[PDB]
Amino acid sequence: IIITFQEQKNERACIDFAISAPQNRQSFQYKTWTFVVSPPFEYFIMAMIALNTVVLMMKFYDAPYEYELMLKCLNIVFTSMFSMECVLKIIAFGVLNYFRDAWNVFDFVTVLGSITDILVTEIAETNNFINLSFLRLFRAARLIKLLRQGYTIRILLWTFVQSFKALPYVCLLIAML
Numbered sequence: 001i002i003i004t005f006q007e008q009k010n011e012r013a014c015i016d017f018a019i020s021a022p023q024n025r026q027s028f029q030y031k032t033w034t035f036v037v038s039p040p041f042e043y044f045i046m047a048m049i050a051l052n053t054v055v056l057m058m059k060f061y062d063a064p065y066e067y068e069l070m071l072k073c074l075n076i077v078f079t080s081m082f083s084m085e086c087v088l089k090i091i092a093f094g095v096l097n098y099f100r101d102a103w104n105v106f107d108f109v110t111v112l113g114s115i116t117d118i119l120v121t122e123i124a125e126t127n128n129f130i131n132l133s134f135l136r137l138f139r140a141a142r143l144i145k146l147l148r149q150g151y152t153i154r155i156l157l158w159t160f161v162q163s164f165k166a167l168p169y170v171c172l173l174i175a176m177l
């Protein structure tokens with residue numbers, strides 16, 4: 001099936017087709033931009049993603065109940081620091097220049113879900129619904145930030161996934177089966 005697969009030159013077409021194809025310096029906005037674009041800031045936030053996932057990995061059954069408390073407090077600290085980092089970006093870069101990144105919006109959504117999870121955990125029992133707990137996906141989904149750091153795995157995933165987007169009817173045939 002691999003050896004004999006019909007196409008429905010190439011690289012030359014792709015190159016010749018794709019050949020077609022920052023913030024100013026006014027005020028404290030520039031101070032925030034210089035603070036957030038500093039390579040130390042990016043390395044620090046990457047390390048903080050790493051430590052947040054370490055904290056996620058630290059949960060275990062029948063914890064001493066003070067270990068649970070320090071895990072919760074570490075989650076509080078990480079969520080608040082990610083929120084203030086999101087605020088630093090939303091002020092340094094334009095709100096239009098932030099919400100139109102497709103990665104900054106992911107960070108914003110995960111931060112909002114994280115504070116929402118914190119708020120609900122205190123008063124979860126008053127809701128009494130099945131969806132009381134899906135808000136814990138956001139802390140685990142902050143692990144996706146390291147996917148960007150892993151460059152070649154990101155490229156491989158992107159190529160294969162967008163290939164899947166180019167095949168919406170083979171999956172439909174499988175679903176019909």
Ligand SMILES: CC(C)CCC[C@@H](C)[C@H]1CC[C@H]2[C@@H]3CC=C4C[C@@H](OC(=O)CCC(=O)O)CC[C@]4(C)[C@H]3CC[C@]12C
Pocket residue numbers: 053054055057058059060061062
């Ligand atoms: C790349 C690595 C070096 C970074 C990530 C390491 C930690 C985030 C992980 C790795 C091993 C994990 C540990 C693996 C096994 C255990 C034992 C486990 O003990 C029990 O389950 C005891 C049961 C009981 O006494 O009731 C407690 C969690 C802990 C320390 C885990 C906590 C989180 C650890 C340290």
